[PDB]
Design a protein around this nucleic acid. Structure first.
Ligand code: NA
Ligand code: NA
Ligand code: NA
Ligand code: NA
Length: 327
DNA sequence: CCGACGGCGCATAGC
DNA sequence: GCTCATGCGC
DNA sequence: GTCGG
């Protein structure tokens, strides 16, 4: 369905979602508004009344009344008032810096720090992550076209293999499902040396090599199993520079790699349906393992997995390649 | 009525 | 010094 | 905010 249809409602609900998360610190209302916004976005009819939309799952009495108001008037009073509230819109805005969440933004705005300029002039008050988020504010809200992601994939797969040909790496996310574009790069990594029951330098070596060929430009956080950082494609000689991009690299035991690959490929809606159907067959699937459930509902030991298909076989589903995992 | 709504790795008050 | 709750992103 | 036990 086009934005034509209910984009007004859907933008309204997303605005309300953002203020619940970033100002009111009400994550569950945030998700409630996002849940209503998406089911409505899927609705292939231009909504004509609050009551019509209240038939959808996740839209209830209050969003129903809000849609009535929008439809009669073209505005929402609460949204307009908050849209011109200096404190509220400043708090909401600063959370667009990766590393500033609702609490940091609240304390910044409480001290006069309201804008990127104010941040730029108060950097002794920012931690390392926030500093990087500030430095790359524009680049991080940009999207990543698929051809740049392939180019990025090429570098990551080539450099990982250079460090140790026994590593396995997969780029997951909507990219793996075929997406025309992406918001970041999510790399899952494993080695035969690393199992649930088994060195602390397997991730560091890949990160390091990727810094030496000057692909990874910055580190937001790094530990034994998860890396969060920044990368950038090499500029094409006398051409404009590429935008810096957000990259995550996670190191997973080999016996849980394919459950991890499954999960981080998604879709999110696909994952719910597969885990829903999996329980109807007596298994419980999480990020890590697939396990059988006894009659009294207690989980047994996780079964061997060596392919994505293994998990499909377990629950008696036909293999669906990532292209067909939209839901 | 009233609780659940995802849960975890890593960076950053209190003893 | 250390442990760990809170913040954050995902 | 919405849902459901
Ligand atoms: Na409903
Ligand atoms: Na944010
Ligand atoms: Na943020
Ligand atoms: Na080798």
């Amino acid at each position: 369905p086009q934005e034509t249809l209910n984009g007004g409602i859907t933008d309204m609900l997303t605005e309300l979602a953002n203020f619940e998360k970033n100002v009111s610190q009400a994550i569950h209302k945030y998700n409630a508004y996002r849940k209503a916004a998406s089911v409505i976005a899927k609705y292939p009819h231009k909504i004509k009344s609050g009551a019509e939309a209240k038939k959808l799952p996740g839209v209830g009495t209050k969003i129903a009344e809000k849609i009535d108001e929008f439809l009669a008037t073209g505005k929402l009073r609460k949204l307009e008032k908050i849209r011109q509230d200096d404190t509220s819109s400043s708090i909401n805005f600063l959370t667009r810096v990766s590393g500033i969440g609702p609490s940091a933004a609240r304390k910044f705005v409480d001290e006069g720090i309201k804008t990127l300029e104010d941040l730029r002039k108060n950097e002794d008050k920012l931690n390392h992550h926030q500093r990087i988020g500030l430095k790359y504010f524009g680049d991080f809200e940009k999207r990543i076209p698929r051809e740049e992601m392939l180019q990025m994939q090429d570098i990551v797969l080539n450099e990982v293999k250079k460090v140790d040909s026994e590593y396995i790496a997969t780029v997951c996310g909507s990219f793996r499902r075929g997406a025309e574009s992406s918001g970041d790069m999510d790399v899952l990594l494993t080695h035969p040396s690393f199992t649930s029951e088994s060195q602390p330098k397997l991730l560091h070596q890949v990160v390091e090599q990727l810094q030496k060929v000057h692909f990874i430009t910055d580190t937001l956080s790094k530990g034994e199993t998860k890396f969060m950082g920044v990368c950038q494609l090499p500029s094409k000689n006398d051409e404009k520079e590429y935008p810096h991009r957000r990259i995550d690299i996670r190191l997973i035991p080999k016996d849980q790699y394919y459950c991890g690959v499954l999960y981080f490929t998604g879709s999110d809606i696909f994952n719910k349906n597969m885990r829903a159907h999996a329980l109807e067959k007596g298994f419980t699937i999480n990020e890590y393992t697939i396990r059988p459930l006894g009659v009294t509902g207690v989980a047994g030991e996780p079964l061997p997995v060596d392919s994505e298909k293994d998990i499909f076989d377990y629950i008696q589903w036909k293999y669906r390649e990532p292209k067909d995992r939209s839901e």
